[PDB]
Every structure is written in C-alpha cells, then in structure tokens.
Amino acid sequence: FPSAVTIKSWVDKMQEDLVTLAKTASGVNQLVDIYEKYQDLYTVEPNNARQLVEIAARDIEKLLSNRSKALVRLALEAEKVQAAHQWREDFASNEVVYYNAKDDLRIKPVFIEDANFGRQISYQHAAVHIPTDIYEGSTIVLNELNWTSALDEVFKKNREEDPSLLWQVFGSATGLARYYPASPWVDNIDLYDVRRRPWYIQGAASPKDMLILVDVSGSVSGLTLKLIRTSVSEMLETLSDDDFVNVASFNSNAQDVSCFQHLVQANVRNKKVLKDAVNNITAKGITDYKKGFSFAFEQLLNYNVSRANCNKIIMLFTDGGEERAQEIFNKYNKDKKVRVFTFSVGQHNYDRGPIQWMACENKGYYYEIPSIGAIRINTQEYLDVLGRPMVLAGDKAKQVQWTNVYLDALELGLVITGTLPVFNITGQFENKTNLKNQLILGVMGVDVSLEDIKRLTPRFTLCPNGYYFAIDPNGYVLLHPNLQPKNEPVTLDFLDAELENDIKVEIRNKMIDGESGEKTFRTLVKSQDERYIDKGNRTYTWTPVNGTDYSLALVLPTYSFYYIKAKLEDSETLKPDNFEESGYTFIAPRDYCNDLKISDNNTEFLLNFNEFIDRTPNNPSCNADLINRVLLDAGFTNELVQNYWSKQKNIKGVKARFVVTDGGITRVYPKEAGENWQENPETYEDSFYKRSLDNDNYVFTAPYFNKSGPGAYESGIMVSKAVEIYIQGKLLKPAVVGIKIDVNSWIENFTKDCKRNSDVMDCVILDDGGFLLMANHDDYTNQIGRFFGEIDPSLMRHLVNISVYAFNKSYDYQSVCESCITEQTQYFFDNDSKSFSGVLDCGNCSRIFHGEKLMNTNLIFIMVESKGTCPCDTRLLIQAEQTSDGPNPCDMVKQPRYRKGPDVCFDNNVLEDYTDC
Ligand SMILES: *[C@@H]1O[C@H](CO)[C@@H](O[C@@H]2O[C@H](CO)[C@@H](O)[C@H](O)[C@H]2NC(C)=O)[C@H](O)[C@H]1NC(C)=O
Ligand SMILES: *[C@@H]1O[C@H](CO)[C@@H](O[C@@H]2O[C@H](CO)[C@@H](O)[C@H](O)[C@H]2NC(C)=O)[C@H](O)[C@H]1NC(C)=O
Ligand SMILES: CCC1=C[C@@H]2[C@H](C1)C[C@]2(CN)CC(=O)O
Ligand SMILES: *[C@@H]1O[C@H](CO)[C@@H](O)[C@H](O)[C@H]1NC(C)=O
Ligand SMILES: *[C@@H]1O[C@H](CO)[C@@H](O)[C@H](O)[C@H]1NC(C)=O
Ligand SMILES: *[C@@H]1O[C@H](CO)[C@@H](O)[C@H](O)[C@H]1NC(C)=O
Ligand SMILES: *[C@@H]1O[C@H](CO)[C@@H](O)[C@H](O)[C@H]1NC(C)=O
Ligand SMILES: *[C@@H]1O[C@H](CO)[C@@H](O)[C@H](O)[C@H]1NC(C)=O
Ligand SMILES: *[C@@H]1O[C@H](CO)[C@@H](O)[C@H](O)[C@H]1NC(C)=O
Ligand SMILES: *[C@@H]1O[C@H](CO)[C@@H](O)[C@H](O)[C@H]1NC(C)=O
C-alpha cells in the first residue's frame, strides 16, 4: 500500500494508455472527419415529436375505425339472418355442408399457402370450430350451423374491400366459432371453449365489483372442499383485469382469506396471491350467513377505494344453508344493486329451497355444480344474466370494446381484438315476446396484430434510444421495446416496463387520461442487457386518441431531435468475395423491400440483398429511404476501413476492430476476427450501441462467463465510443466504433506492489456494474468477465454501503424459468467523485483499500490487501435474473397506481324479467 499519490500516478498512466489505445485503434476522429467532410450527400431533418405523435394517433384511429366498421356490418347481418330463421328439425333431406376443422383432412379444401398467414389457408370456404364435448348431429347445434352459414358472404366482402384484415370470428352461446380464411386447426387434447375466452367474456357483460363469499364450515371439508377450491379458482380465471374482487370465508364470522380487506384490481399478481390463499383454506366451524353478507355489503359500500362504480354483485359458494338473512336483504337494498349468485358445489342432502329462494329473490341466478365436469361449463352463465341490462339498452349498449395484448390461439403472435354482442333482434316493430331476447346469441370479433400497429410506427427514422409506447386507461402498455411474450394475456404496467420515477408517476397520474403535453426530465435509463444503467435526460410527448380510450407517447433524448437522411441519389462493397479487403459485412434484416424476406442466416440474406439491388432506383413498390440510408452508410464504413484500418494490418494488443451504424452495416477488418462475431446484425437491437449513445466516455463491455463459444481469451475485451457530429450547430450521434483488447497483452502490460504468484495484496479493475476485467492473482483472470461480488463480496458490500455504487432492482414478470419473477439488479456510479479510501473491518483483522476511477472511462481501479490475511465472506453477491417473489402484494394495494374506468356501465335495468328461479 504505497501511497495515494502513487495510486494517482498508476491510475493516470493506465487511463492515458487505455484511452490513447482505444482512440487510435478506433478512429472516432477519422469517422467524424469523414461525416463532416462529406456533409453534402445527406440532409439533417427535424423530428417534430408533437407532429409525429399526432400522425401516429390519427393512423391508429383510422385502422381501429376500419375494424369497427367491419365488425358492425357482420353483427348487423347476423342479426337479420337469425331474425329470419325458420328453425327446421329434419335435416336428412338437406345434408348440411360445412368445413369442420380438426377432422381427418363437408368440404375437401385446397389449402393454398399465402403470406402474412404462416399456415395453409382457404378463401372460398369458412371453417367451423366445435369443442369436443359438444355433440354434433343434434338439431340444437345444426340450427346454428344453418343460420350462421350466411355469414361467409359478409366475411368475403370484408376481406375484399379491405385486404389487410387478419381474422374475423363469430362465437355463439352454443359453442360454434366460424372464422373466415379457413385453416386446419392447429392441433395436429384441448380444453378450448369459445365462451371461456377473454375476448368473449369482455363483450358478454359489463365490468363488475364482484365478491366471493365461500362457505368454510366443517361440513364442506374433503371432496367438496377441493371442488369448491377449483370452482373459485376457475371463477377468478373467468374474471378479467378490469374487475374487482375479494374472497371471504365466513366461519362464525366473516374473516378475510387474504391480506387485502377491500376490493383490488384483480390483476395477475392479486389473482395468484388469492389462488394461494384459497389453496390454503382450513374449514372448521359452523355457518353464520348474517355476518358474511353484512361484511360483504360494507365492503361493497366503501366508496373510498379505487373502483369502477359499476355492476356490483356477490357470489355465494355454499353446500347447505337455511338462514334467510332477510334483515340484510329486505331493508338495506332499496337501491337493489346486489345480485346474489348462489351456487351449490358438490353433493348434499340439505334443502335447496332457501338457496334457490335467495338466488331468485336477490336479482341473481342459481347454479348446481355436481362434479369437476360442470365447473368448466356451469361457471360462465352469470355473464348471460349480467347481460340483461345490456340487451335491454340495445343500440346504446352496442359498442366496440378492444382487449389487451395476448397470445393468439393459432400462432400469429400478439394481437388485440374487438367485440360486439349479438341478440335476438326478432320482431321489435311489434315487440311480441321479448322473453328470450334477454339471452345473448353470442359475440363476434376481428383481430389486429401488433405487427400491423408497429407498421404505423416508423422506428428507423430516429436513434435507437428513441421509441414509441402506448398505454390504456388501466395503465398497461400496448407497444413497448421491453414488451416480449414468454411462450395468459401479456400484462406489463408502464412503471413496471420502464424505470420508476416520481416524474413518470406524475405524468401518468396527471396528463395521460385525455390530456396533451410535453415534459423534459432527467431519469435513469436501463440498458438492453440486464447489466447496466445510465443517467440521462429525455422529453416525453403524449396525446389522447379520440377514437379509442388508448393513449400514445413518444420518447426522444436530446440528441435525436434531428435525424439524417440521404440527399436524393458503393453497392459492390457489400460483396462476400470482397470481404478480405472490405471487412466481414453484416446487414440488418430490415424490411428493405417487399419482394425479399427475413433471412436471419444473414449470408444468403446479404447475397439476396445485393442481388435485388443489382436487379435500379426505379423501386415501384420498394422502400427507398431505408435503401438510401443503408447504401450511404455502407459507403462511409467502407471508406473508413479502406483509409484507416487497412494501413495497420495487425496490432499486438488489438485483436479485432468494428463499427455499427444507423442503417444496419457492421464490419470487422479480418474475416477470421469476423467469424467469432456473436452479436446480431440489427444495429437497433445490440446493447453496446445504445450504451455508447447514452454514455459520453469509452464504455468497456465485459465478456460473459461460463458460456458455450470461445469469448474470453480468443475474442478479448470490447470497447466502444459513439461518434458526435455538428453540421449547423446541433448534436447528432450516428455510429459507434470499438476494438478487441488482447487479454494476454493486457495481463503482461498490467504486470508493469502488484506482483502475481502471491497472496498479500490484490490489484483489481472493475466497471459500471462490478464486472471483472483485469487481475494479477492468476485465479481471478481465468474467471474473467464475472461479477466482482461473486468472487469478493466483502469489498463489494463495503463499496455499496460507502456509496461509490448504487443499485436498482427491477421486476420482470414476463420471463421463462425452470409466472416467473426476476429480480434484475443493475449497479452504477452515483457520486461524481474519483477518490475513495478507508479501512474495512471483518472483526479480528483489518484491510486497507484505495479505489480511484479512471477518467474518460467507466472503469475503476481498486487496490486492497489479499483475503488470505482476512477470511471474510458474510454472504455472496450474485447479479442475475433472480428467482424471487416481490414486491409484497399485500402492501401495494394500500397505495395502488392511479387508474381510470369506463363511464358506460349497464346495471339495474328498470324492466328486467328475472321470473325464472
Ligand atoms: C332466440 O333464438 C332461439 C334460437 O337460438 C329461438 O329458439 C326457438 O324459437 C322458435 C321460434 O321462436 C321455437 O319454435 C323453438 O322451439 C325455440 N327453441 C327452443 C329450444 O325452444 C328463439 O325463438 C329466439 N327468439 C325469438 C323471439 O325468435
Ligand atoms: C502497453 O503499454 C504501453 C505504454 O506503457 C503502450 O505503448 C504505446 O503503444 C502505442 C500504440 O499502441 C504507441 O503509439 C505508443 O508510442 C506506445 N508508448 C509507449 C511508451 O510504449 C502499449 O500500447 C500498451 N499495450 C497494450 C496491449 O495495451
Ligand atoms: C376459435 C376460432 C377463432 C377465434 C378467433 C381466431 C379464430 C382464434 C381467435 C382470434 N385470436 C380467438 C382466439 O384467439 O381464441
Ligand atoms: C381503411 O379503409 C379505407 C377505406 O375502406 C382504406 O382506404 C384503407 O386502406 C383502410 N386501411 C387503413 C389503415 O386506413
Ligand atoms: C336450413 O335448412 C333447410 C333444410 O333443412 C334449408 O332449406 C334452408 O335453406 C337452410 N337455411 C339457409 C341455407 O339459410
Ligand atoms: C437535461 O435536460 C434538462 C432540461 O432540458 C436540463 O436542465 C439538464 O441540464 C440536461 N442535462 C444535462 C446533462 O445538462
Ligand atoms: C381529439 O382530442 C384532442 C385532444 O384535446 C382535441 O383537441 C381534438 O379537438 C379532438 N378531436 C376530435 C375530432 O374529437
Ligand atoms: C447459413 O447459410 C449458409 C449458406 O451458404 C449455410 O452454409 C449455413 O449452414 C447456414 N447456417 C445455418 C446456421 O443454418
Ligand atoms: C460452469 O458451467 C458448468 C456447466 O454449465 C458447471 O458445471 C460449473 O459449475 C460452472 N462453473 C462456474 C464457476 O460457474
Ligand atoms: C433507484 O436508483 C435511484 C437513483 O439513485 C434511487 O434514488 C432509488 O431509490 C433506487 N431504487 C431502488 C428500487 O433501488
């Protein structure tokens, strides 16, 4: 431990060496000089966030309006055809002809392949879906097959007028599903009912302030207990993420099963914790109805918590109950706002009389659940009886409702769909019966893919840091770079998606529910890897969409306010046989032109690209801006490689050199050094590019540890720095460059006290995130590129608590583990100080350390005495996708995120029949 001045000198020498090597071997100056010297084949253009937000909002409104129009016409035609149906019985004479999918491949279809639909499709016929439990050959379904045989013409008309429709289906209470571009069922067993789907259920009823009141007496233990638990689980599954629910189990007293005590949003986390709670039921005691309904009613009368102010109902799960509990029904229901849905799960000798009487005297309905067979079917019927006010409202109630993003059930990715209910509109010029008009015939919907939405989002005209994201009133995100499936609808809150900050909370709480404005603020930015974060400032611009409840926002860091494009008009430089002279080329598989296809193999893709370019700027239907950009970018990169990298054939310390750039061209000077390139050729999706755009200094990216593929000694350490240009006075950051540092050279030049082969002191260097990059111990350097906490936790904890390092812990619910919650920890530099000293103590012994950050880099040099003298490992610091369960769902419902609800709800209709008991 020589001295602070000695450490100063050592750090100064190391920083000067590393910075001069990176700068010289990268040629950032040369690249900026090329850009600024040309300055005539391109043209910088303003990126007006407000204007682009408005344009995207109008386009998305127009698309959704088109879909709504199609859905409306389909519903009207269905209404007419069902109105004029003669309802025959004998179908022997007229053999009903229809294509039944999932059969042994009625019609023998041709099934021609087409684009935009990965599977074989047909257009002349539509396909019919039948759940396996539903029996065909009965008149009860064959009447539906008949009257729905007339929707094919309207399907064809929709597809003809607008060729961009993805899908269109009709779901009836019978169980049929007719979707137009007839494809074989994906199943080459399945519990698929069209009724048991989010898109069906959303349109079949209104949002509800529902409660479950489980009977938990001593008599409901065993087979009936498991039956009731399964029934409650499936009722929760039936419930959506715009409703509110609790489950109380009255046992001489209305105790709460869970830790909420008031109505909660019933999103995925609440659902899961409630499933755990209802799986941990203990049933021992007697029955007392009065307390249960009193507790439920005072929960339903809160009006201090976040609720929808909509169809408040109560569902009772009981085995046997004779109490009338009429002192809580007769008096405290002048508003008549409760619907008691009394169930009967399992087998019991107790009288059904009071149960059915309570069911049909409190505006609700009665059900009987004998076994597991009926739980899947006899659970969904409450939506039919909640739809009675909706059908009575009729034209007012007929509105299109869009769902959240979810995994398409036949492998087309993430899709949102519309919905519209279909009635017995049958003779209302006289209004003869109107008795079965209460029951809904079914719903129908049209699908739009997030690919179609993102086609309206030109993400390639700005920096990779910039992006579009859209949010719903519930607060979930519609589009986001971080929005990825796992294979359950994809649920991702805005705060959950991006970083969490008071300014973001404020903008969501204040100016997203129909307001327009902008705000520039400084907040942390999470790197694309789960390794790094960085400080920066951004401005968000948002507008409301008039057509739909959704809202759109745009993100623009204050260096992508402008963008660069090609001013009007080297192609042979992108040729594999010329790689040995022009670097090893990758090209980003962007949708450059409609003729070509995504060919991620990328070498046949590169030859395809250059072949198509050879086969002519005419471009009848060929995207010109991207082609111009990539050609200009390839010109710049090739000139760099020819004029700078060619002169120095090889350098002892420089294992490789590279460049990525806006347009999608990346080049490695040796083909041998390009063979072991592992990063994808999409410029916008590699992490180090974004990292270098964010940072103002050289960024050192640690290699991975314990991974297949040689990336430690035969690849080296990767450095990066973004290029900055000034044309008329405003900053632009087109590209980044970098090199590969030879590990052996770095060892032997770091050896320049800090001798090896001994355990007295450690001389170790880190970066922003505590990843090891160099060591002299000869046992740390073998395990290079791994988190410093996993090898030396005591010193890392001392650094964290002395606050040279800060950390955030994001939670990513969308992940694959072997639903899965990942604790993503990111360490970073917080304080703007470059000198740290002190003594860390583990008890009997002591250790002296002195760290100093390297200037113009994200590196820090730490000197400390060896751990041979001080055995100290309290707990191991690990930095990975942790298997955890956080935050606590009991505590975050007390202060829930701000939410807005629909203004239109249909409950308490004046003239409902409800005569059936
Ligand atoms: C509502 O639609 C149903 C079919 O889904 C109709 O049910 C049949 O209606 C005819 C004529 O009204 C009766 O002769 C049948 O016996 C009915 N079926 C059953 C099972 O009884 C129903 O009529 C429709 N409502 C109206 C007013 O037409
Ligand atoms: C090892 O460190 C030495 C300096 O201590 C570096 O030597 C310089 O190398 C650059 C080119 O890389 C030359 O332009 C300088 O003139 C050299 N200076 C001196 C004093 O030798 C060397 O680059 C380092 N090598 C590695 C592998 O990092
Ligand atoms: C069951 C037949 C169909 C329903 C439409 C389409 C075809 C699958 C569908 C659109 N995503 C609903 C669903 O995904 O379950
Ligand atoms: C919407 O419909 C109009 C008219 O039917 C059509 O011109 C247009 O291409 C459709 N699609 C979009 C996204 O506007
Ligand atoms: C329904 O079936 C009858 C024969 O049972 C047939 O005459 C009638 O045309 C069918 N309805 C249609 C095609 O709408
Ligand atoms: C970021 O932007 C804000 C507002 O425009 C500004 O006050 C702040 O100084 C900026 N950050 C830096 C690094 O200057
Ligand atoms: C759409 O909403 C914006 C938001 O304030 C409003 O200014 C505009 O007038 C609305 N346009 C229509 C046609 O409703
Ligand atoms: C990519 O395409 C080339 C065609 O030259 C082929 O040799 C190679 O095996 C392909 N790579 C993969 C991973 O399939
Ligand atoms: C490295 O990987 C192998 C297999 O994946 C495993 O057995 C071993 O424990 C790992 N070593 C370390 C240090 O993580
Ligand atoms: C995230 O980092 C910021 C910046 O220092 C800090 O104020 C905040 O408390 C951190 N949050 C978590 C969850 O660690």
Q: Which two tokens stand for residue 26?
A: 């990268």
Which residue, among 830, 823, 838, 813, has the nearest Cα to 877 in the 3D structure? 823
Q: How far apart are CA 12 and CA 320, in angstroms?
A: 83
The finding on whether 652 has its CB within 6 A of some atom of ligand 1 is no
The finding on whether 263 has its CB within 6 A of some atom of ligand 2 is no
Which residue, among 20, 39, 40, has the nearest Cα to 28 in the 3D structure? 20
* Residue 581: its H or E element: helix 579-582
Q: Which two tokens stand for residue 178?
A: 């007719």
DSSP, collapsed to helix, strand or coil, labels residue 15 as helix
DSSP code for 771: B
DSSP code for 681: S
Nearest ligand to the CA of 695 is: 6
For ligand 1, what atom is nearest to the CA of residue 87?
Answer: 10
Exposed e or buried b per residue across 146-177, where buried means at least 16 C-beta atoms within 10 angstroms of its C-beta: bbbbebbebbeebbeeeeebbbbbbbbbbbbb
Do 346 and 372 contact (CB within 8 A), yes or no? no
Q: Domain 206-378 is of which CATH architecture?
A: 3-Layer(aba) Sandwich (3.40)
Nearest ligand to the CA of 650 is: 2
DSSP, collapsed to helix, strand or coil, labels residue 201 as helix
Q: How far apart are CA 204 and CA 195, in angstroms?
A: 9
Do 37 and 546 contact (CB within 8 A), yes or no? no
Resolution value in angstroms: 3.2
The finding on whether 143 has its CB within 6 A of some atom of ligand 5 is no
Residue 758 counted as an annotated binding residue? no
Which residue, among 563, 509, 515, 503, has the nearest Cα to 539 in the 3D structure? 503
Q: How far is the CA of 538 from the centre of ligand 6 (A)?
A: 9
Q: How far apart are CA 290 and CA 109, in angstroms?
A: 62
In angstroms, the Cα distances linking 139 to 88, 92, 103, 747 are 8, 11, 20, 83
The finding on whether 808 has its CB within 6 A of some atom of ligand 10 is yes
Q: How far is the CA of 706 from the centre of ligand 9 (A)?
A: 6
The CA-based dihedral angle spanning residues 675, 680, 686, 689, taken in that order and rounded to the nearest 10 degrees: 50
Query: Ligand 1: which residue has its CA nearest to atom 19?
Result: 140
Exposed e or buried b per residue across 812-833, where buried means at least 16 C-beta atoms within 10 angstroms of its C-beta: bbbeeeeeebbbbbbbbbeeee
Residue 217 counted as an annotated binding residue? yes
Please provide the DSSP assignment of 89-150 as one string. ---SSS----EETTS--------EEETTEEEEE-SSS-EEE--TTSPSSSHHHHHHHHHHGG
Please provide the DSSP assignment of 136-185 as one string. SSSHHHHHHHHHHGGGHHHHHHHHHH-TT--EEEEEETTS-EEESS----
Bridge partners of 501? none
Q: How far is the CA of 885 from the centre of ligand 6 (A)?
A: 37
Q: How far apart are CA 40 and CA 35, in angstroms?
A: 9
* Residue 775: its H or E element: strand 774-775
Instruction: Please measure the distance between the N-terminal and C-terminal CA atoms of the chain and give it in whole angstroms.
Output: 89
Nearest ligand to the CA of 600 is: 8
Which H, E and C letters describe 255-317, residue by residue? EECCCCCCCECCCHHHHHHHHHHHHCCCCCCCCCHHHHHHHHHHHHCCCCCCCCCCEECEEEE
Query: Ligand 3: which residue has its CA nearest to atom 4?
Result: 169
Q: How many CA atoms lie within 13 A of 807 on its CB side?
A: 19
Tell me the fold of 466-559.
Answer: Beta-Lactamase (3.30.450)
Count of beta carbons in the 10 Å neighbourhood of residue 81: 16
User: For 318, phi and psi rounded to 5 degrees?
Assistant: -135, 160
Which residue, among 262, 94, 117, has the nearest Cα to 183 in the 3D structure? 117
Inter-axis angle of helices 268-279 and 223-238, nearest 10: 170
Q: Which two tokens stand for residue 428?
A: 């209302």
User: For 646, phi and psi rounded to 5 degrees?
Assistant: -65, -35
Q: How many CA atoms lie within 13 A of 581 on its CB side?
A: 7
Q: How far is the CA of 90 from the centre of ligand 1 (A)?
A: 16
Please state whether the peptide bond connecting residue 887 to the residue before it is cis, i.e. omega within 30 degrees of 0.
yes
Q: Match 């002169």 to its residue by tokens.
A: 647
Q: How far apart are CA 908 and CA 896, in angstroms?
A: 29
Handedness of CA 783, 784, 787, 788 (dihedral sign): positive
User: For 249, phi and psi rounded to 5 degrees?
Assistant: -120, 100
Establish whether domains 56-203+391-451 and 753-896 are of one fold: yes
Do 424 and 434 contact (CB within 8 A), yes or no? no
Do 543 and 528 contact (CB within 8 A), yes or no? no
Alpha-carbon 91 to chain mean position: 49
The finding on whether 749 has its CB within 6 A of some atom of ligand 2 is yes
Which residue, among 555, 453, 529, 371, has the nearest Cα to 63 in the 3D structure? 453
Amino acid at residue number 25: A
Gaps after which residues in the chain, C–N over 2.5 Å?
105, 188, 487, 569, 615, 752, 818
> What are the start-end ranges of the E strands in 672-760?
699-701, 717-722, 725-726, 731-732, 735-741
The CA-based dihedral angle spanning residues 629, 634, 635, 639, taken in that order and rounded to the nearest 10 degrees: 150
The finding on whether 544 has its CB within 6 A of some atom of ligand 7 is yes
Do 684 and 629 contact (CB within 8 A), yes or no? no
The finding on whether 809 has its CB within 6 A of some atom of ligand 10 is yes
Domain ranges of the chain: 1-47+568-742, 56-203+391-451, 206-378, 466-559, 753-896
Q: How far apart are CA 797 and CA 808, in angstroms?
A: 15
Q: How many CA atoms lie within 13 A of 664 on its CB side?
A: 23
Q: How far apart are CA 595 and CA 16, in angstroms?
A: 51
Which residue, among 292, 283, 282, has the nearest Cα to 325 in the 3D structure? 292
Q: How far apart are CA 779 and CA 791, in angstroms?
A: 10
Probe residue for ligand 3, chosen from 148, 410, 412, 443 as the CB with the greatest number of ligand atoms within 8 Å? 410
Q: How far is the CA of 655 from the centre of ligand 2 (A)?
A: 15
CATH number of 753-896: 3.30.450
Q: Which two tokens stand for residue 387?
A: 């739809």
Q: Are strands 822-829 and 882-883 parallel, antiparallel or unpaired?
A: antiparallel
Q: How many CA atoms lie within 13 A of 528 on its CB side?
A: 18
CATH H superfamily, domain 56-203+391-451: PAS domain (3.30.450.20)
Q: How far apart are CA 809 and CA 801, in angstroms?
A: 16
Q: How far apart are CA 722 and CA 737, in angstroms?
A: 7
Q: How far apart are CA 125 and CA 153, in angstroms?
A: 10
Q: Are strands 99-100 and 127-129 parallel, antiparallel or unpaired?
A: parallel
Nearest ligand to the CA of 146 is: 5
DSSP, collapsed to helix, strand or coil, labels residue 318 as strand
Query: Ligand 6: which residue has its CA nearest to atom 10?
Result: 537
The finding on whether 48 has its CB within 6 A of some atom of ligand 6 is no
Q: How far apart are CA 636 and CA 616, in angstroms?
A: 21
